[PDB]
Design an enzyme around this catalytic site. Structure first.
Site, short mmCIF file in Angstrom:
data_model
loop_
_atom_site.label_atom_id
_atom_site.label_comp_id
_atom_site.label_asym_id
_atom_site.label_seq_id
_atom_site.Cartn_x
_atom_site.Cartn_y
_atom_site.Cartn_z
N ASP A 5 0.69 -1.19 0.09
CA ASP A 5 0.03 -0.01 -0.02
C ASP A 5 0.84 1.23 -0.10
O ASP A 5 1.24 1.66 1.15
CB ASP A 5 -0.96 0.04 1.45
CG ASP A 5 -2.01 1.01 1.11
OD1 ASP A 5 -1.84 2.06 0.01
OD2 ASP A 5 -2.76 1.30 2.04
N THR A 6 1.09 1.97 -1.14
CA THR A 6 1.68 3.09 -1.28
C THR A 6 1.31 4.15 -0.85
O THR A 6 1.72 5.51 -0.39
CB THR A 6 2.36 3.45 -2.74
OG1 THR A 6 1.10 3.51 -3.70
CG2 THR A 6 2.90 2.34 -3.30
N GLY A 7 -0.22 4.32 -0.57
CA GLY A 7 -0.98 5.34 0.00
C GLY A 7 -1.05 5.11 1.62
O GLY A 7 -1.80 5.93 2.31
#
Ligand SMILES: COC(=O)N[C@H](C(=O)N[C@@H](Cc1ccccc1)[C@@H](O)CN(Cc1ccc(-c2ccccn2)cc1)NC(=O)[C@@H](NC(=O)OC)C(C)(C)C)C(C)(C)C
Ligand SMILES: [Cl-]
EC number: 3.4.23.16
Lengths: 99, 99
Positions: free
Chosen positions: A25-27
């Site tokens: 999850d880059t967010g």
């Protein structure tokens, strides 16, 4: 690997000798796992997502393997809907976004 | 480009003639933007994240430019804390995770 995004980027992780599925999850600033047992002391953290904030337990210097890559870092534990691997550990395994 | 994850992967987007900052978010099924006007018809949707669900307006076939790359897809609009570019549009610009 190179992971395309047509499906959720779910990988296998290993923590405390247990295999689990988690979302790359880059967010996410942080790594947040569903309720489980971890060793040592924890400290409080409030984390905010869509919907609002939840209270979680912060464990530091936790051993976790992500898609076969070893990491050691901060793992949050609480009422998350899904296991999330955030940027604190994505960086340890050498993850980048590319286009 | 190659985007490292030491910091939040924020990029400039262009949508409805407006320039906005948004988060490249592999942990998001959907693209969800802070309140704005968009053309055409919409329908309500509930989306869920860490802190529960929020109600958003779903607009389909919306043109968006992400970091110089044109794409078309569904854009949700509502009370998100941050502008999020989700997988539905990340695929279209050829965005992958690599490690
Ligand atoms: C600086 O704050 C953060 O880093 N917040 C992170 C976070 O919530 N990130 C969101 C994006 C975000 C950033 C900053 C503020 C608010 C939101 C995502 O990267 C993580 N995420 C992780 C996540 C994924 C699923 C669910 C979920 C919720 C209800 C039912 C099933 N799944 C919850 C969290 N995805 C979603 O919430 C997405 N949900 C989604 O794709 O649902 C299928 C949205 C966005 C489309 C709503 C964590 C709390 C995980 C650390
Ligand atoms: Cl779409």
């Amino acid at each position: 690997p190179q992971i395309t995004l047509w499906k959720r980027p779910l990988v296998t992780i290993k923590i405390g000798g247990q295999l689990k599925e988690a979302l790359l999850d880059t967010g996410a600033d942080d790594t947040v796992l569903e309720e489980m047992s971890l060793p040592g002391r924890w400290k409080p953290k409030m984390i905010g997502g869509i919907g609002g904030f939840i209270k979680v337990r912060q464990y530091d210097q936790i051993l976790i393997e992500i898609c076969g890559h070893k990491a050691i870092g901060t793992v949050l534990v609480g009422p998350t809907p899904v296991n999330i691997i955030g940027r604190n550990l994505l960086t340890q395994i050498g993850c980048t976004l590319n286009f």
